[PDB]
Amino acid sequence: FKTILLAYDGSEHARRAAEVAKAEAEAHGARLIVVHAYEPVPDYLGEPFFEEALRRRLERAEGVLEEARALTGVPKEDALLLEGVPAEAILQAARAEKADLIVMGTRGLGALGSLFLGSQSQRVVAEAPCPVLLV
Amino acid sequence: FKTILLAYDGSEHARRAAEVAKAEAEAHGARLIVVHAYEPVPDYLGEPFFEEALRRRLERAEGVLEEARALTGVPKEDALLLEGVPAEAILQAARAEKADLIVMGTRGLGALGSLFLGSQSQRVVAEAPCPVLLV
Numbered sequence: 001f002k003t004i005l006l007a008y009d010g011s012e013h014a015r016r017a018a019e020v021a022k023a024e025a026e027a028h029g030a031r032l033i034v035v036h037a038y039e040p041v042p043d044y045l046g047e048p049f050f051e052e053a054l055r056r057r058l059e060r061a062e063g064v065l066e067e068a069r070a071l072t073g074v075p076k077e078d079a080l081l082l083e084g085v086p087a088e089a090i091l092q093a094a095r096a097e098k099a100d101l102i103v104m105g106t107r108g109l110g111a112l113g114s115l116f117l118g119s120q121s122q123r124v125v126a127e128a129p130c131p132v133l134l135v
Numbered sequence: 136f137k138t139i140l141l142a143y144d145g146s147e148h149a150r151r152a153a154e155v156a157k158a159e160a161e162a163h164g165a166r167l168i169v170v171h172a173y174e175p176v177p178d179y180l181g182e183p184f185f186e187e188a189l190r191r192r193l194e195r196a197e198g199v200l201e202e203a204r205a206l207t208g209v210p211k212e213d214a215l216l217l218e219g220v221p222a223e224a225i226l227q228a229a230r231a232e233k234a235d236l237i238v239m240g241t242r243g244l245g246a247l248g249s250l251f252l253g254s255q256s257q258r259v260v261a262e263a264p265c266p267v268l269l270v
Binding site: 028117122133 | 136155158162163241251252257261266267268269270
């Protein structure tokens with residue numbers, strides 16, 4: 001493992017995954033890339049509600065990603081923010097960064113999800129080329 | 136990770152998982168435990184067919200586990216064989232060995248299973264306390 005990607009949504013699951021990812025990168029001497037994906041504000045919202053929500057959404061998204069960066073100690077350039085569905089985003093980042101391992105919580109927040117697997121972890125386990133470390 | 140457990144069923148998935156597990160143990164300086172579970176011969180088989188099948192079943196099971204041992208280089212005492220359902224067995228071995236990480240193929244052979252996840256990996260992801268590395 002030369003490049004490890006951590007999917008971080010801010011949940012306790014993600015916090016535990018962050019601790020695992022940090023240890024993993026240190027053990028393999030790999031570069032750790034952290035990623036947080038956020039949902040775009042619904043276009044059905046009218047003015048000025050849409051604009052206000054847009055600003056807040058981005059601030060909170062950046063806030064969550066900063067927490068991940070503080071937890072892992074990675075440089076700002078290795079802390080990525082993607083707009084859209086987390087799974088689509090993780091897979092997207094994994095390819096662009098040529099990741100060799102994806103570390104993520106078995107469960108998380110968002111759209112669907114069950115007590116078994118989050119919808120996002122399910123999509124990653126289903127479509128990721130590289131190994132997936134579920135925590 | 137101090138103790139890593141590799142579930143090995145002999146499939147190509149398992150062979151790739153073995154390579155990952157070996158690297159993982161070396162990176163963390165952890166003890167690697169390999170496990171292979173085999174299904175008990177159906178009691179409905181009459182004599183002497185049941186007895187003949189019993190002997191062959193065990194020989195092949197030991198043969199598969201030996202391959203895993205040759206792949207990982209672990210000592211004989213750290214190569215375990217369990218009779219029963221692989222998932223039940225992996226979880227059983229994980230507890231007894233106080234494993235901190237389970238490494239296994241996303242898919243495998245046996246009872247159920249889909250192109251998404253093998254029935255065994257699904258049970259492990261659903262009930263294992265420790266992180267699961269899906270390869």
